[PDB]
């Protein structure tokens, strides 16, 4: 599964799905430009 964007995640265990990447500043998937 992944995540969307305010949901919680860890750089070192990535669970963002595509065009996503999860910050750890921010700590949630953040949308990767």
Known sequence: ???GWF???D???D?????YTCS???RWCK???
């Open 7 to 9: 949901k919680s995640c």
């Open 31 to 33: 949308y990767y430009l």
């Open 1 to 3: 599964d992944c995540l």
């Open 24 to 26: 750890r500043r921010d």
């Open 15 to 19: 669970k963002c799905c595509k065009n």
């Open 11 to 13: 750089p070192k265990n």
